[PDB]
Design a protein around this ligand. Sequence first.
Ligand code: MG
Length: 364
Amino acid sequence: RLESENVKRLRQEKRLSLIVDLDQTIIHATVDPTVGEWMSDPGNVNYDVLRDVRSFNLQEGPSGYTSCYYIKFRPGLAQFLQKISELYELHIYTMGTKAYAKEVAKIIDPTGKLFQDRVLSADDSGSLAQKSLRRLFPCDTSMVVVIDDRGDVWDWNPNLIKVVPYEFFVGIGDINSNFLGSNREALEEQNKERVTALELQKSERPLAKQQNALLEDPSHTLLHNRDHELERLEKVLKDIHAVYYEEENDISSRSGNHKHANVGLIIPKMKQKVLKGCRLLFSGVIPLGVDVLSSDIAKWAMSFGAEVVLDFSVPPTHLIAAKIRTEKVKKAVSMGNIKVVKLNWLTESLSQWKRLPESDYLLY
Ligand SMILES: [Mg+2]
């Protein structure tokens, strides 16, 4: 069959498989018409950083509602995809529509060389709330790595490399997130909701409002290129690849090629070094009434080796606090030997695969 033969082929090519999210992983998209105006004006403070933005029109829904999408490609993307395709067979897996995914692929991959037809979208993935490795590799996930800005859609799968969400168009989120986590609504209800959100973004012009506020106050320019995430990510993926093929060489030779390596084992071993020895207590971060140990932030932290505790019975190493005026903070301070830090210490450390100095994240 095809699946078992693809695994064999990849090993002969000495490659792995990479599932690549679009929105806020390798692109950021908006329908704010402000972008088109700024792009058309060489004199605009935002023009220079918009020069590489590309756009397309999509007609959407029963009524053929039409929007101009503006796409910012994350810095270094062309180079990143070229280099990483040497090591990984690339797939796209997005919660956007098939039409959207195809429009983006036409721009990043015009001749089909990088992704060919390996493009999964909301239309054909099987779910509007979660993604699954099994949609592509039902029987054997040992060679597949994921890059995605969201861990919740993957249930914090051990094959996931969560990336820093790309936010170039300041204040614009993920325009394709509208149906994450939820039940399946009637198609009529889905289209009403999307048209509504798009129309709202067009009419409110959040970019214009934010830019105007800054000017009314380089620091006055809204948009900037300050993202270097793909340079970091390249190194991680190159490491995973090299560790896999060294372990594969060892395991397969010792087993008469009956056993093999597994990135799902390799990746957690890499991650668990980062916050090894940390025991985290959260204060005012998880909402009252929400289960802490199954929360996204707890799962993210535990994937990087941190323990999470719920009280001081065994004193934590860190108190991750959102508000300063709590008995947890008072107790932590009065106890001593506990570092009290903003949430940012944790999210930025996890993001950089590197425990950052706590002294840089104190509360006051
Ligand atoms: Mg995304």
